[PDB]
Design a binder for this molecule. Sequence first.
Ligand code: RNA
Length: 559
Amino acid sequence: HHSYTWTGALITPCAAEESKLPINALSNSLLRHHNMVYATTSRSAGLRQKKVTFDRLQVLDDHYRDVLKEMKAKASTVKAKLLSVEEACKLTPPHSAKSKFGYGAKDVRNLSSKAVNHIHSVWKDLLEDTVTPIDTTIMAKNEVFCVQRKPARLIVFPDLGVRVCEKMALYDVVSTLPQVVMGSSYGFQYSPGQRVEFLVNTWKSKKNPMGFSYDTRCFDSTVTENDIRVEESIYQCCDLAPEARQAIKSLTERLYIGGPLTNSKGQNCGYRRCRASGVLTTSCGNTLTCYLKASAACRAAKLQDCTMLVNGDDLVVICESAGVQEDAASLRAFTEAMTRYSAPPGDPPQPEYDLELITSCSSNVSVAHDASGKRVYYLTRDPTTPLARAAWETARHTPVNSWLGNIIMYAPTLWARMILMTHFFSILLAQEQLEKALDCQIYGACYSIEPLDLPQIIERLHGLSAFSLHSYSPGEINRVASCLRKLGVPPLRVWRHRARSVRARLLSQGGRAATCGKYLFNWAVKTKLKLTPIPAASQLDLSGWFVAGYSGGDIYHSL
Ligand SMILES: Cc1ccc(S(=O)(=O)NC2=NC(=O)/C(=C/c3ccc(C)o3)S2)cc1
């Protein structure tokens, strides 16, 4: 019952890899301690293979089955539709991994006969073959981090022709079923502010609030064949077309459960018997299995009024405290249960009685004040990784601009406004690329966004308060200040100074550019403006922005 088996072939790169932070003329103005930023590469794939390769054991008791039966009863009320080959295609990212059968993402999006005929041949093979394992490619992701060096993560994905077929049979399911089964516990249905809201209201629901985060040690590797089959049984509970049921069954047996691993060179690296990180059901699967295991664990551990918030493999639990002494005990029992369900923790979970001290989705709740001086809760996080990535994207263009994604998700934060906004807008101005659409990610899905619409976007997601927050918490202030010293990032006084400059320049521009300068940097000027609502704000269709998670799902939404 090992998560993986390796032949011995190395996981090879499909192009040149950079580990050292690239440096240009704009680098120093943002970060000076360059040697602290790095990117993971193949050179460490070997190290990761050892950490994710182990034997999984499972003991399923009555609590587990009782929770599963409840989840299935809700799943039965779901009606999912089959997507046409045309629809699935328009959901394919413009720069997704090209197929090894004579066509690419560009051909898919354009509905090229070659790509369409191949996708149809794959779909037919799926309905007729429910046993032959589907091939997958294993790659070492190139992610940027700040020292303390972690080994590169592994991404496993099937050929483009298959990815389009997954969408057709499962897109609607992974987009609607999660919220029906888990209700308010499904995290991907909330925007940053809504997540904070649900968290605060829940915490205030308990007489004596007690919460903790649960970090599983390499969740994907703990996912067993049983878990993947249970996932399929839940999908099958939905009202689906017979053709969709067949495809879902086939994808499960042939791909989701396991399959052979092939490096970029074409060599078999081994076999997978755990969760594939690069399939459409990765987010939904991880969320359903994590919610199922934790729900049962809360019953085994005897937690009281346990409310959960699940986002893929990330779990948050808020319940009624029974005393600092009991909490610690129950929590330990919870862990044991989870472990028995094949979900061992990497780091021992610790009970918290302070909301702001609980970190989930790499983020935490915090408080600041708006113009009126009213206390306002917002979602923030440790800026280390976001800044390290900003340094990299400062000297190197990337497929996904994290700085943009981060601004959108953390616009109300001190670090995002003060540094990310000031820095990147300064650059956009110098290159006159303000109206140039850029790609970023939100819950794993890829979105094309124009920097000039940021003000309207932020208003819709966070509210005008995002443009006037001040007097942050000491805890937040120190964490930001510390990170700045660590990386060697200029102080507030510097950014404020640069912001007035960028602001004055944006105003001069006029139109959307003036709007950006007025709302995004109003915090820099001594004489703050009124900052009223924005007209075109409600013109964008931010519908599918916060519905579900698609991490590794190769999903693209044309905004
Ligand atoms: C993006 C932004 C930047 C600055 C402001 S503010 O008007 O100077 N009010 C603040 N409140 C704090 O908690 C702050 C942290 C803080 C205090 C001292 C240092 C170095 O950082 S500043 C507002 C918004």
